Amino acid sequence: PPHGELQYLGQIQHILRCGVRKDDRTGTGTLSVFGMQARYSLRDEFPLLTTKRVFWKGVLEELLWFIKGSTNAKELSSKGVKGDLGPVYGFQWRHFGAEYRDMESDYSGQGVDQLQRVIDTIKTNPDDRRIIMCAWNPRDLPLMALPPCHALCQFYVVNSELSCQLYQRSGDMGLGVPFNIASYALLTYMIAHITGLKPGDFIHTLGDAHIYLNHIEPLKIQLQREPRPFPKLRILRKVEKIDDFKAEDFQIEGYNPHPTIKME
Amino acid sequence: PPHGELQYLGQIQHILRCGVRKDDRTGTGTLSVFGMQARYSLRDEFPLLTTKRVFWKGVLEELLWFIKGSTNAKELSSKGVKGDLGPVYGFQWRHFGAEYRDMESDYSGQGVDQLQRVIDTIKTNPDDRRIIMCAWNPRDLPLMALPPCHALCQFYVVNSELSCQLYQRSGDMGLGVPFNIASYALLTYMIAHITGLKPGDFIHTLGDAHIYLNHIEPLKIQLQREPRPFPKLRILRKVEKIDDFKAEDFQIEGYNPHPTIKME
Known part of the structure; x- marks a missing residue:
């Protein structure tokens, strides 16, 4: 009617032609262009890409783990998904601002709950x-x-519509970008559900968007594929407190993507 | 060859048609669309708009005042440009992180110099x-x-080219947007000059971009105008320390814009 993934695939085509090779911190090289924007409509649909399969469970999983505010990977990895780790996302969102030591020390009554x-x-x-x-x-x-924030998600409401715009400092177009999309979108799809709103738009702004050398070919192939009709997520229940969103409270429907694409 | 201001004028046209009226904090109403990107090339040129006149002095002025890190408006207003004020931009950049009281108390040996x-x-x-x-x-x-940052400017270098990407939380397309552009661009034009680099690109990302009700018509008129060839800034001198950039060290050339446009 347009198409949205097209947006992704488009920039991709752009990255590969006339993107400059640049080596990052690890030392590995990539192709990258500075600055990119994409707008995915979350209205009666879900931007969970189709020109490749996406680990939905892997998304919903990890997400619920951040919202649940846990720094213990086992709390998430205990569902087949990938001595402690440290202040990841499931802490910088809720218990942020308060000194952290471990995971079994309930900060319930601590932190500056950003969410x-x-x-x-x-x-x-x-x-x-x-x-x-x-x-x-x-x-x-x-x-x-x-230390400068890696990301940030400014929100925006109007006409009863909530629409998040994510801005990441650096972008891994390969397998990273596809992930976050359905991720933050899902989050957005939940916030509005508990804030009496309706999903609007997703905008994905990026600083250093890049492709990894050992990723080109598969993506070159990924291009040939043609986007299929996007899913449609259904929150099979009514909630009001963000911390009760149970795993099995979502149902992706209308999702028939092209074969996976193991990327490094 | 393309044109850049076109970018501005374009979004503008977009704002006015199918932008939704929304009232801000002051209470005044506006038309706004969530999320916008523009890329202005700073290569052998300067994005100092032409379909209206821009207060160059007003830009260069204030800018030098922030870089000089002063919280006293008189330090800037003492050049015809608009008991103290508070931690503005000329402090959150240099003396940030250290308790502030007034302006005549040299923090020279304080702050976490962000710049x-x-x-x-x-x-x-x-x-x-x-x-x-x-x-x-x-x-x-x-x-x-x-408190969440109002803005942020991620920088990016490659092939000897420095290119800043500014992301503002809210955008006043009317008279605000045009300003910052030449502003941060100028800044960028200076950094690279002292960091042995060459100006690359400017990217202006925005959250709530809007137009003020009492601004429509003039802008409607502003559209009819046609962009002219962009200026070209020349830093008439060699420096290495960002704090010596004197006012009369810049020379805009090739600047012939359309008449001003008093906006509120």
Whole structure:
């Protein structure tokens, strides 16, 4: 009617032609172009890509683990999904601001719950702009005092529609980008459900978008494939508290993608 | 060859048709669409708009005042440009992190200089991504603990080219947007000059981009105008320390715009 994945596939085509090779931190090289925007409509649909299969469970899983605010991977890895680890996403969202030691020390009564606030601001003053929500890459926290956020998701409501816009500092188009999309979208699909709203749009802004050398060919192949009609997620239940969203409370329907694509 | 202002004018046309009216904090109403991207090339040119006149001096002025890290408006207003004020931009960049009281109390030996760092990271590890640089709207600092950044400018280098991408939380397309462009671009035009680089691209990402009701008509008129060839800024001198950039060290040339447009 248009198509959205087209957006993805499009930039991809762009990356591969006239993107410049550049080597990152690990040392591995990539092709990357600075700055990219994509808008995926979340209205009566779900941007869970079709020109390749996406680990939906892998998404919904991990997501619920962050919202549940746990720093223990086993809390997520205990569902076939990939001595502790550290302050990942499932802590920088809820128990942020309070000194962390381990995972079995209930911070219930600690932290500056970044997520709730958002959920609340939508309930209080939707006409606001500063509905932002930062997040960080653990590897940088002590790496340097006053460490810059890896991402952030400004929210936006109007005409009863919630629409998130994600801005990542760096982008791994290969297997990263496809993931986050359905991820944050899912999140957005949940917030609005508990904030009496209706899903609007997803916008994915990026800083250093890149492709990894050992990823080109498969993607070259991935291009030939043709996007199919997007899914449609259904939250099979009524909730009001973000922390009760149980795993089996979502049902993807209308999802028939092209074969997987093992990327490194 | 394309044209860049076209980008501006384009989104504008978009805002006006099928943008939704929405009232902000002041209470005044506007038309706004969530999410927008524009890329202005800074190569042998300067994105200082032509389908209306821009207060270049007003830009260069204020800019030098932030880089100079002063919280005293008189330090800038003392050049015909618009008991103290507070932590504006000329402090959140340099003396950030240290308790502020007034303006005549030299913090020279205080603060977590956000700008220098960037200038330095370009000198140290350009292949990096986290070249970000936050900033805030003073009105929110005590307004709420853990206040979200109003903006941020991730930097990016490659093939000897520095290219900034500015992401603002909210956007005033009317008279705001045109300003910042030449602003941050100018900044970028200076950083690369002291970091042995060459200007690349400007990308202007936005969250809530809007138009003010009492701005429509003039803009409607502003559209009819046709973009002229962009300027070309010349830094008439060689420097290496960002704090010596004197006012009269820039020379805009090739700037012949359409008449001004007093906007509210």
